[PDB]
Hints:
The structure is cut from a larger assembly and holds two copies of chain A. In chain A, 0% of the residues lie in helices and 0% in strands. The first copy, chain A, is mostly loops. Chains A, B: This is Major vault protein.
Amino acid sequence: RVEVGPKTYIRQDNERVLFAPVRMVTVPPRHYCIVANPVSRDTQSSVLF
Amino acid sequence: RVEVGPKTYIRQDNERVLFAPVRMVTVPPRHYCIVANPVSRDTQSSVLF
Lengths: 49, 49
């Protein structure tokens, strides 16, 4: 699962952090991007775990 | 927390098992025992976590 934001959220020992904090994807105006295997979304288009 | 019964319940990695399965305390008829720092109990005298 994702962990995001200006938090110093320490990992639990049961958890494992695979990588250093990757930059959140930025999408410039008048630009586009495509991602395979997208997360599902509802009518609110909220992420659905 | 306790884990008891004829189960092959494997430990989770986050969990740690301090010791080998100690025998459940046996209390013979016409005998008695006393334990300091008893677990709390309700009106049902069920264990209260």
